[PDB]
């Protein structure tokens, strides 16, 4: 935990931001958590790509290769945002190249290839289950899993659920030592995440995160944080709005992060 005014400031942030806000922070220094609306369901949008690349990483631990297995990219595979796979159409990408592209560039084509390889949404969910996450559910594919319609449980998780699941994956032992590091390597290389959580933390703090955008102004970010001379933090910030066509609010997440790391 922290103080009585974090919740007041969070609710202030929420009300003034014109939406709905979910937060879960874990401080590995003392296993204190800050939790705002952290038991309500939020639409993961591209944050779900962490569960995909990680579900594969686990498989690599019982398939001495796998991560180099090449995967065909086809013209019919293409969806709105594919910054990487567009360069290997009629070619191949290994599962590592795909995970890499999905995590660091939010490559929607990549994401679908990850879902495909692990047997579809339900088997990504079953992966979260075996990690002790009984909340995460992935139900659809790129691009539809980002609809983020209010009331709709599909492709949601809770901030508590995902902060803990993320802690296990990136810091704990949900993965092998070398898979864990690899997941950390990919997150730390994310290209897209600067205006979000990271904008709310001391400039000198080191961030590996995955943002997520979607319908209804849904702006999300999930992050592992290594301050110099501290123990690391898990911070999960979900935010969504009422207008179907609202613009993203990356700064609401940064503001969230400044609030829940004040005094650290």
Describe the model.
With 264 residues, this protein is α+β, with helices and mostly antiparallel strands. It has one domain (4-261): DD-peptidase/beta-lactamase superfamily (Beta-lactamase, 3-Layer(aba) Sandwich), CATH 3.40.710. Helices cover 35% and strands 19% of the residues. The protein contains 8 helices and 9 strands. The strands form 3 sheets. The protein has a 5-stranded antiparallel sheet, with helices on both faces. A two-stranded antiparallel sheet has the order 3-6. A hairpin with a 6-residue loop joins strand 8 and strand 9 (233-240). The radius of gyration is 17 Å and the shape is globular. It catalyses: a beta-lactam + H2O = a substituted beta-amino acid. It is an enzyme of class 3 (hydrolase). Its EC number is 3.5.2.6. Residues 23-237 form the Beta-lactamase class A catalytic domain.
Q: What's the short story on this structure?
A:
One of its GO terms (biological process) is response to antibiotic. By secondary structure, the chain is an alpha+beta fold.
List keywords for this structure.
5-stranded antiparallel β-sheet; Beta-lactamase; two-stranded antiparallel ribbon; alpha+beta; 264 residues; signal; hydrolase; EC 3.5.2.6; 8 helices
Gross CATH architecture: 3-Layer(aba) Sandwich
Strand content: 15-25%
Intertermini distance: 12 Å
Helical run tally: 8
Question: What is the radius of gyration computed over CA atoms, rounded to a whole number of angstroms?
Answer: 17 Å
Strand order in space, largest sheet? 2-1-9-8-7
H/E series, N to C?
HEEEHEEHHHEHHEEEH
CATH class: Alpha Beta
Structural class: alpha+beta
The shape is globular
